[PDB]
Point group: D2
Chain length 122, copies 4
């Protein structure tokens, strides 16, 4: 139980993370789609003392899409909530910004939504 | 990365102090002028440490969870954007602010907006 | 088969729409949540000649949350795709802007995602 | 609604011509300075026809499907925002641009951004 673990989203991407006691998120991300191969570094933050009223735990993290294999000149941030219990979720919305010229900045940022569970796809 | 590293302010009057590491790390503190926030908060993020040199911006993002040793808003913001270098350096962003909610209220958990940061120099 | 019909999202809201031959969307929306009661007018647009390569049909619509019962001083736009076939979907992301003072404009706009099907909840 | 009704231009140089009806309707045409677009496109939307009078903006939104009698981009944009009246009238928006995609490519279907419109007067 908790944020720390291996998570998978609806695309089949793999999010491996450790939640530090005082709010750090640290791990790796492997995307099933896009200009990406293998694992990328991620860092983020989470609320390390959530409310005690049934609310989720706010969090977010970033991946810059550069590793030893590829550089897509882009970065994604995920913002969302962890929802605990017997079917633990992380429900997110994300912003993927590509480096562009200023004139093309209007088309620099994709938006979407990812839902993560600890269930490995089969 | 001397470009990104420094002190920045946005249109709301918020203060972003950041260091860009050789490995692509962003670390620093954020102080918001608005919202359920006081003092400085930890931020962490990532940037493209080997960006295109064809006139394109440098992609980056960072997160603040709105808990510090004074206050906890039970929320987190992520900024996604690009650094545009030169003498009038800017970081242009869009952001998502998610509050912890009950499941019934999750539909109203996330605000969206845009911040432009100017480097103090 | 088609966009015209009665749709329901994951919240249990009801979206009743007619797709005009040349791109109009016209109908009503009833939200299961929020500062809303009964039906509200909606209008929007869709691509009335979609690609023939398996792509979805782009569309969007707006509701201003004023009717004879309530006025929330807000408006939502949904932007997304219709995906036809034997389990027809409308997959959307939305922006809900409330009227605010300029100083509070930073907190004026909620974002989320709704998926619609023609299956009435039970 | 004389306030909203008129001709507006955004920071890209796009042209928004709109009429606000007594019933809350928005109707008009949009011409984009950028993207897979030429000439005018139909728009339709809605606004709050009885807004607060406490200093708040007037909520509104509209849609353009990027098909006209010259071109079809297989895409649609919605703008969600508020009208701020007075002598320096503005419509401040965020937008979502969804392109039709295959199901496999749906993750990359939607762009987000922000436009500010100034009324020509
Ligand atoms: O193509 C790129 O610029 C890099 C890869 C982006 C993959 C995106 S991030 C949001 C979405 N969720 C995923 O797991 N993968 C895609
Ligand atoms: O109210 C909260 O939940 C915490 C503070 C949020 C402040 C937001 S983050 C996006 C925007 N940019 C800022 O500098 N401040 C606001
Ligand atoms: O509370 C308001 O300001 C008016 C009602 C908003 C309801 C929102 S629109 C997006 C989401 N999808 C729905 O079916 N209902 C909520
Ligand atoms: O490229 C397309 O799919 C059609 C044209 C899109 C133009 C976009 S809509 C949001 C932004 N604001 C504008 O005035 N133009 C761009």
């Amino acid at each position: 139980a908790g944020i720390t673990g291996t998570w998978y989203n609806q695309l089949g991407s793999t999010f491996i993370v450790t939640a530090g006691a005082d709010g750090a998120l640290t791990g790796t991300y492997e995307s099933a789609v896009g200009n990406a191969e293998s694992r990328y570094v991620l860092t983020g933050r989470y609320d390390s003392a959530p409310a005690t009223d049934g609310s989720g735990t706010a969090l977010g993290w970033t991946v810059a899409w550069k590793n030893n294999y590829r550089n897509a000149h882009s970065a994604t941030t995920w913002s969302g909530q962890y929802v605990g219990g017997a079917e633990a979720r992380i429900n997110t919305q994300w912003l993927l910004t590509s480096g562009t010229t200023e004139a093309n900045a209007w088309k620099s940022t994709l938006v979407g939504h990812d839902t993560f569970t600890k269930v490995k796809p089969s």
